[PDB]
């Protein structure tokens, strides 16, 4: 502590499992955190994405509510982080992210267990482990990106404002040879010189990306910060 005029700082974490068919389940139906069991969390923001780490503590061995989340690789995990601070007046920040990775679980003991989970914004952490390579004909780009996008019980992406990606192309060569499809989402987006916008709704959490070829009032009609 030893600060002024910070009154309170309460931070929460909401954790759900994500099934085979990319919908949600219930384990308060989740593993909420508290008066912090958290040693350390790291978050960086961008216009496009979120990264970082998360460490926390639990107890003990064993309980069936803790088995399915943190004892297996390759199960996707929502991480709803809310930060709420009061001073006077209150201000809130909120994060939504998915973290799963193959071939990596970090757990420590010495009945207190440690854990280490990473962060990506949900379009990245899903399309990383997804490598198609095929040919399309007579299809524009926004026709392509929604053919690979199978996520509507999680979030949505808003491509209705660009009017450059919807130009038709007769020969398409989608190629992920040694690389990631999420790179292909960004590389050809660079050669059309567009914007990405990660955006959370604090009330309530519904992530929706935005791709606008300029910067206008219409985006600024949708970063209206729900504060006073």
């Amino acid at each position: 502590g030893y600060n002024n005029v910070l009154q309170k700082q309460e931070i929460t974490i909401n954790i759900k499992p994500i099934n085979k068919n990319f919908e949600l389940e219930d384990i308060h139906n989740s593993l909420t955190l508290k008066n912090p069991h958290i040693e350390k969390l790291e978050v960086c923001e961008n216009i496009y994405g979120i990264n970082g780490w998360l460490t926390f503590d639990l107890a003990y061995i064993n309980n069936h509510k803790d088995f399915n989340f943190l004892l297996s690789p390759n199960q996707p995990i929502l991480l709803d982080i809310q930060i709420n601070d009061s001073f006077h007046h209150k201000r809130t920040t909120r994060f939504i992210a998915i973290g799963f990775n193959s071939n990596s679980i970090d757990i420590h003991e010495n009945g207190v267990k440690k854990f280490k989970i990473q962060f990506h914004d949900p379009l990245k952490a899903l399309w990383t482990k997804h490598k198609p390579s095929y040919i399309a004909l007579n299809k524009s780009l926004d026709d392509i990106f929604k053919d690979n996008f199978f996520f509507d019980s999680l979030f949505s992406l808003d491509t209705n404002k660009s009017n450059n990606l919807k130009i038709r192309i007769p020969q398409a060569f989608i190629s992920t040879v040694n690389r990631n499809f999420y790179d292909f989402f960004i590389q050809q987006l660079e050669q059309n010189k567009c914007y990405l916008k990660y955006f959370c709704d604090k009330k309530s959490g519904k992530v929706s990306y935005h791709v606008v070829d300029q910067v206008d009032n219409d985006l600024q009609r949708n970063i209206v910060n729900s504060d006073e």
């Binding site: 008066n35 040693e39 978050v43 216009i47 970082g52 040919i135 004909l137 007579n138 020969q171 960004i186």
Partner: protein, 214 residues
């Protein structure tokens, strides 16, 4: 407090010189954050038996507003084998002929009518012009599983494949070709994996050296 430390694509006015900056700079914005939220030694002790903060900001000029892209990977090339066809119902007099295509549609063309006009002029190509295409049928298993379209990719001409600087033997149909895809929307034609004339005897009965034509 009292700011917008939440990423908007907006403006923030400037009157105080309590940044380093420069005095001739108008409105700014915020492009990043970083968040190091640790756990102090106070909250740890009662919760082990039974926080600290640091926030940075990235601030740039509003007049230099550019999109920001993370690091990505430029891709490499994969090889596709494919045929050449002309139409779909081919006579047996004109079974091995050649046809040139205009504009990504099944339309006849010539080497002429394009011929950037240092070439009209006689019959001599310089620089091996684009916008003349080959109908190439590719094995159906590289399209999507919903596509009800017959797979034909058009590609430009290397005229110097079945030839030299004198011969004009264009690619007939019903041959087999390695195709690179060197970038997005740029394919190329490299080698031939095909023939029409071979000695089918045991290299002691015959010694054939021939050119079939036409």
């Amino acid at each position: 407090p009292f700011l917008d430390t939440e990423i908007t694509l907006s403006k923030l006015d400037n009157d105080q010189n309590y940044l380093l900056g420069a005095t001739d700079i108008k409105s700014l914005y915020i492009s990043q954050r970083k968040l190091l939220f640790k756990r102090s030694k106070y909250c740890s002790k009662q919760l082990y038996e039974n926080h600290d903060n640091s926030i940075t900001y990235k601030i740039k000029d509003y007049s230099n507003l550019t999109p920001e892209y993370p690091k990505y990977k430029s891709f490499s090339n994969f090889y596709i084998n494919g045929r050449i066809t002309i139409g779909e119902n081919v006579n047996n007099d004109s079974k091995k002929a050649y046809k040139f295509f205009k504009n990504h549609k099944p339309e006849e063309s010539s080497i002429a009518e394009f011929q950037e006009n240092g070439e009209k002029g006689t019959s001599a190509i310089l620089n091996s012009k684009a916008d003349i295409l080959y109908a190439i049928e590719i094995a159906k298993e590289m399209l999507s599983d919903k596509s009800s379209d017959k797979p034909i990719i058009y590609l430009p001409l290397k005229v110097n494949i079945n030839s030299a600087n004198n011969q004009f033997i264009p690619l007939r149909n019903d041959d087999i070709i390695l195709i690179e895809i060197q970038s997005f929307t740029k394919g190329e034609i490299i080698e031939l994996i095909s023939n029409s004339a071979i000695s089918t005897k045991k290299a002691q009965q015959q010694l054939l050296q021939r050119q079939l034509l036409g």
